Design a protein around this ligand. Structure first.
Ligand SMILES: COc1ncnc2[nH]cnc12
Length: 294
């Protein structure tokens, strides 16, 4: 750490405080993420170490891992804004569709890359999607979930949001897959379009029931095996599925079609990042440069 000058406290991360800092020997401006006691387990150090080679232009670059006095810091490429802040800022007018389309397409490339190596995010959320002045968007904290877990509360006891959590996680599946990230990104896509979170649950049952109210209560017809999952209850209320036309106006037929595929209940049938990239929604994708005030 004495290789760095902290600049400001940036944020409270999932795992610890996040600092903006400058490397005294190289000038680089970085994000430093403290990872909150018998030292760091050796398994977590090896997992993190693999993430140093999982490099992609839509994945926030992991520069280095600093483990001293049994205290752990991750050094990351610094980006100046996140999608949560950008959405809050664009509330009056909404993010223009070409920009939505570009961010979704970039995020899907990020996912297609990571998922080709069977690495998951598992906690995608706007606060994790970071943006630069060149029109890029990038996934932050990719693979930390496998390395450190996803806690119910953060180190500051802030509630970890359930809003982007896939139904198979909520229903207690042990061995969920890359599809969980597709679900999260679908929820984000919808939030970009509508300017409101799709499923803003405030408990696990509220999260599930919000999902069911919009998409229909899942059954063995649309999701084979669902009634056998650990937290499935036969007594769940039975809601009918809503039309996507009601859910995400004014999204066009292509975007509604894609969204529907990203929100399929059955994780086997949910579209892959690779397949999503071929969807007709992206036929006319561009890379607009957003209006950013820093
Ligand atoms: C808040 O987290 C962060 N802020 C700015 N840059 C980052 N890079 C990775 N995490 C970041």
């Amino acid at each position: 750490m004495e290789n760095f000058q902290k600049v400001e406290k940036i944020g409270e991360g999932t795992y610890g405080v996040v600092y903006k800092a400058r490397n005294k020997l190289t000038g680089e401006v970085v994000a430093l993420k403290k990872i909150r006691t018998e030292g760091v387990p050796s398994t977590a150090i090896r997992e993190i170490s693999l993430l140093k080679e999982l490099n992609h232009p839509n994945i926030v670059k992991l520069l280095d891992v600093i483990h001293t006095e049994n205290k752990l810091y991750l050094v990351f490429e610094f980006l100046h804004q996140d999608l949560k802040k950008f959405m809050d800022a664009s509330a009056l007018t909404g993010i223009p569709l070409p920009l939505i389309k570009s961010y979704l397409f970039q995020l899907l490339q990020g996912l297609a890359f990571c998922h080709s190596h069977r690495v998951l995010h598992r906690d995608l959320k706007p606060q994790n999607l970071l943006i630069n002045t060149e029109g890029a968007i990038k996934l932050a904290d990719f693979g930390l979930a496998r390395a450190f877990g996803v806690p119910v509360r953060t180190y500051t006891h802030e509630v970890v949001t359930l809003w982007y959590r896939a139904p198979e996680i909520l229903l207690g599946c042990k061995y969920y897959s890359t599809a969980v990230d597709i679900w999260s990104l679908g929820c984000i896509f919808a939030e970009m379009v509508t300017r409101r979170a799709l499923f803003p649950g405030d408990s696990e049952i509220d999260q599930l029931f919000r999902i069911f109210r919009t998409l229909g209560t899942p059954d063995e017809v649309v999701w084979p095996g669902v009634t056998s999952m650990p937290d499935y209850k036969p007594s769940f209320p039975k809601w009918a599925r809503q039309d996507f036309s009601k859910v995400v106006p004014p999204l066009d037929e292509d975007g509604r079609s894609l969204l529907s595929q990203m929100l399929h209940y059955d994780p086997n049938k949910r579209i892959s990042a690779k397949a999503a990239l071929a969807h007709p929604f992206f036929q006319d994708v561009t890379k607009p440069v957003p209006h950013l005030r820093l």
